Amino acid sequence: NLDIIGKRIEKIKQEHETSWHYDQDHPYKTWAYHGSYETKSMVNGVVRLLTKPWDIIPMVTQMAMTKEKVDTRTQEPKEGTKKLMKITAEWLWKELGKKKTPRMCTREEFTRKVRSNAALGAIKWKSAREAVEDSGFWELVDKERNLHLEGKCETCVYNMMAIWYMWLGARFLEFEALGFLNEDHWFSRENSLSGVEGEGLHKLGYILRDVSKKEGGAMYADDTAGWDTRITLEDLKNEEMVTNHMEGEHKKLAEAIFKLTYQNKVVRVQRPTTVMDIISRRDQRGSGQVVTYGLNTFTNMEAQLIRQMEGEGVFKSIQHLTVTEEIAVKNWLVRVGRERLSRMAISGDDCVVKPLDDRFASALTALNDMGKVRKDIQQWEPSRGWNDWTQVPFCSHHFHELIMKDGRVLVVPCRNQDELIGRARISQGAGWSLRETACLGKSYAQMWSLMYFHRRDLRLAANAICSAVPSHWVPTSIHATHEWMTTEDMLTVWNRVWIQENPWMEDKTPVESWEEIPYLGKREDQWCGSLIGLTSRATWAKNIQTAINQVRSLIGNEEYTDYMPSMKRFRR
Ligand SMILES: COC1CN(S(=O)(=O)N2CCCC2)C1
Numbered sequence: 001n002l003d004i005i006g007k008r009i010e011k012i013k014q015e016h017e018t019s020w021h022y023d024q025d026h027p028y029k030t031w032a033y034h035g036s037y038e039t040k041s042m043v044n045g046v047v048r049l050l051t052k053p054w055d056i057i058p059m060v061t062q063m064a065m066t067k068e069k070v071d072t073r074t075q076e077p078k079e080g081t082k083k084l085m086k087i088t089a090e091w092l093w094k095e096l097g098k099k100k101t102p103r104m105c106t107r108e109e110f111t112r113k114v115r116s117n118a119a120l121g122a123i124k125w126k127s128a129r130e131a132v133e134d135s136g137f138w139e140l141v142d143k144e145r146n147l148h149l150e151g152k153c154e155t156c157v158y159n160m161m162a163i164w165y166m167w168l169g170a171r172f173l174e175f176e177a178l179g180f181l182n183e184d185h186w187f188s189r190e191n192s193l194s195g196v197e198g199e200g201l202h203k204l205g206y207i208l209r210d211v212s213k214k215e216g217g218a219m220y221a222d223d224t225a226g227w228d229t230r231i232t233l234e235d236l237k238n239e240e241m242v243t244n245h246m247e248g249e250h251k252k253l254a255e256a257i258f259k260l261t262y263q264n265k266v267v268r269v270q271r272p273t274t275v276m277d278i279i280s281r282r283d284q285r286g287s288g289q290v291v292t293y294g295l296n297t298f299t300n301m302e303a304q305l306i307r308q309m310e311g312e313g314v315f316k317s318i319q320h321l322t323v324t325e326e327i328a329v330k331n332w333l334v335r336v337g338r339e340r341l342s343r344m345a346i347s348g349d350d351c352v353v354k355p356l357d358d359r360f361a362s363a364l365t366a367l368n369d370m371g372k373v374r375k376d377i378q379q380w381e382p383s384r385g386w387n388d389w390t391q392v393p394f395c396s397h398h399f400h401e402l403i404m405k406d407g408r409v410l411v412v413p414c415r416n417q418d419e420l421i422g423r424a425r426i427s428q429g430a431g432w433s434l435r436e437t438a439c440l441g442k443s444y445a446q447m448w449s450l451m452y453f454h455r456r457d458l459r460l461a462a463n464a465i466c467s468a469v470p471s472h473w474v475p476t477s478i479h480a481t482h483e484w485m486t487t488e489d490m491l492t493v494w495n496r497v498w499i500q501e502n503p504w505m506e507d508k509t510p511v512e513s514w515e516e517i518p519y520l521g522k523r524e525d526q527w528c529g530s531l532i533g534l535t536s537r538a539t540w541a542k543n544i545q546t547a548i549n550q551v552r553s554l555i556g557n558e559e560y561t562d563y564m565p566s567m568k569r570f571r572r
């Protein structure tokens with residue numbers, strides 16, 4: 001314990017030896033308190049001016065205004081639960097590894113990611129780009145590395161905010177050991193028949209409909225109450241078994257990240273009373289946001305196969321597994337494991353399962369005892385499943401089946417339109433020029449034109465924003481692919497995404513205009529949040545050229561395209 005965290009603790013203690021106070025009124029009983037020291041949501045105006053009807057919708061406007069979960073302790077699974085998890089985890093890493101080779105990620109790869117600007121949740125150097133251009137930083141990584149090979153840690157400390165930051169150096173060493181999981185698509189659907197990494201919103205609906213085609217019971221989509229807080233040291237040990245597939249240096253580096261920064265953690269949390277509190281603990285999810293996605297997917301795949309085993313009566317008791325029950329669990333995994341993975345869509349802590357039958361609904365002993373407690377339902381109340389794949393929630397969406405005038409079938413993502421409009425009206429951080437604010441609006445507009453084209457208000461607002469922002473200005477700012485981030489014409493990108501590259505579309509005839517591209521039903525559009533039929537919305541649509549001109553006047557004398565005549569009503 002303190003042998004693995006002390007140096008990190010000893011080091012911090014000194015840089016702040018002037019104020020090292022062992023507060024006796026610290027609010028902790030689940031963390032291990034160590035000491036304390038002295039320390040010290042903006043609206044996008046381009047989108048808001050082009051969405052005026054929503055200025056009076058509280059679900060939109062309230063989105064732009066303005067832990068007791070982390071300080072909890074998950075129990076220890078029982079012998080039979082621990083055996084089920086170890087056997088399943090061993091088999092799952094083997095399956096994921098059959099067509100993939102673990103490998104170390106490179107300084108070169110990491111530098112390019114930073115040059116391309118990506119969320120690396122990092123903290124001598126201003127930005128992350130400058131540090132990647134300083135050899136001293138790399139000498140620091142080297143000292144830290146050999147330390148990890150020396151089987152010890154000095155500088156890999158978390159900062160809670162609850163999303164924990166590490167400094168760029170410790171992010172590098174995490175990426176070097178484990179980035180292959182994401183960089184080489186270990187959770188692609190093709191490689192892990194449950195995963196959806198890299199799939200994209202335009203694919204998720206087709207995937208759920210493919211699961212719906214399997215013979216079986218209802219579709220179950222139980223959310224876990226605070227997934228990251230329910231990750232057990234036993235979960236962290238089964239995730240570590242990926243190092244068993246590694247060799248040489250890599251295996252040792254990966255082992256150190258798991259041992260020193262996962263199965264042991266040191267965190268700095270700011271407390272108002274404002275001090276810095278240096279706390280530690282073993283279990284719970286604390287990793288980069290990308291590694292956390294992959295390991296969440298893995299452990300979720302594991303938990304859901306075990307829940308399926310319980311429904312199928314592969315085992316009777318989580319208390320203890322018989323010897324013949326071990327061979328049966330193994331027989332089941334080898335005989336039907338891949339078939340049972342294909343009955344799932346799993347995105348980190350989010351899942352949809354189509355089990356063999358509805359015994360799964362009341363198979364709760366392993367799921368509860370693994371600590372993966374379901375959200376807003378009583379611990380022993382059977383799960384309520386969905387009968388129709390078009391009503392299943394997944395990755396904050398539902399999916400509609402939409403028939404084009406030519407008979408071809410689109411499966412399209414959807415959510416409450418208030419949520420879509422409210423999110424596009426928010427920027428993150430400040431220092432934003434009018435130009436950079438306009439390019440973010442453009443990025444939302446292009447997303448709506450490709451993914452939400454079927455919502456009458458969003459196709460009209462997207463056309464209006466793309467009309468209001470200079471034509472050649474470039475849009476700016478893990479299951480997803482951002483095809484809207486481009487200056488290419490949006491009808492050409494629509495054709496590539498929905499027709500050309502769409503494996504569920506046999507007829508490859510390109511669409512010639514936006515009017516070939518259908519909408520949801522008028523009533524189905526209202527149900528999912530549309531303002532069609534309101535007076536405010538009618539005035540907005542009728543007078544849209546006046547709103548477009550207001551924003552053009554603010555941005556100034558630039559080159560604009562009118563995209564509004566791409567809609568039937570706006571044709572002279
Ligand atoms: C469900 O009710 C719908 C409200 N209308 S509409 O005709 O005003 N409308 C539909 C296209 C945009 C204007 C019927």
Ligand SMILES: [Cl-]
Nearest residue numbers: 386387388391
């Ligand atoms: Cl249903």
Ligand SMILES: [Cl-]
Nearest residue numbers: 443444447477
């Ligand atoms: Cl975006």
Ligand SMILES: [Zn+2]
Nearest residue numbers: 153154155156
């Ligand atoms: Zn370290």
Ligand SMILES: [Zn+2]
Nearest residue numbers: 398414415528
């Ligand atoms: Zn909908």
